[PDB]
């Protein structure tokens, strides 16, 4: 998971 990548959130930016
Ligand atoms: Na990912």
Swiss-Prot record:
Tissues where this protein is expressed: Highly expressed in the pancreas. Detected at lower levels in heart, placenta, lung and kidney.
Subcellular location: Cytoplasm, Cytosol; Nucleus
Post-translational modification: (Microbial infection) Proteolytically cleaved by S.flexneri OspD3 within the RIP homotypic interaction motif (RHIM), leading to its degradation and inhibition of necroptosis.
Primary role: Serine/threonine-protein kinase that activates necroptosis and apoptosis, two parallel forms of cell death. Necroptosis, a programmed cell death process in response to death-inducing TNF-alpha family members, is triggered by RIPK3 following activation by ZBP1. Activated RIPK3 forms a necrosis-inducing complex and mediates phosphorylation of MLKL, promoting MLKL localization to the plasma membrane and execution of programmed necrosis characterized by calcium influx and plasma membrane damage.
Entry note about domains: The RIP homotypic interaction motif/RHIM mediates interaction with the RHIM motif of RIPK1. Both motifs form a hetero-amyloid serpentine fold, stabilized by hydrophobic packing and featuring an unusual Cys-Ser ladder of alternating Ser (from RIPK1) and Cys (from RIPK3).
Family: Belongs to the protein kinase superfamily. TKL Ser/Thr protein kinase family.
Assembly notes: Interacts (via RIP homotypic interaction motif) with RIPK1 (via RIP homotypic interaction motif); this interaction induces RIPK1 phosphorylation and formation of a RIPK1-RIPK3 necrosis-inducing complex. Interacts with MLKL; the interaction is direct and triggers necroptosis. Interacts with ZBP1 (via RIP homotypic interaction motif); interaction with ZBP1 activates RIPK3, triggering necroptosis. Upon TNF-induced necrosis, the RIPK1-RIPK3 dimer further interacts with PGAM5 and MLKL; the formation of this complex leads to PGAM5 phosphorylation and increase in PGAM5 phosphatase activity.
Protein name per UniProt: Receptor-interacting serine/threonine-protein kinase 3
Coverage span on the entire protein: 458 to 461 of 518
């Amino acid at each position: 998971v990548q959130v930016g």
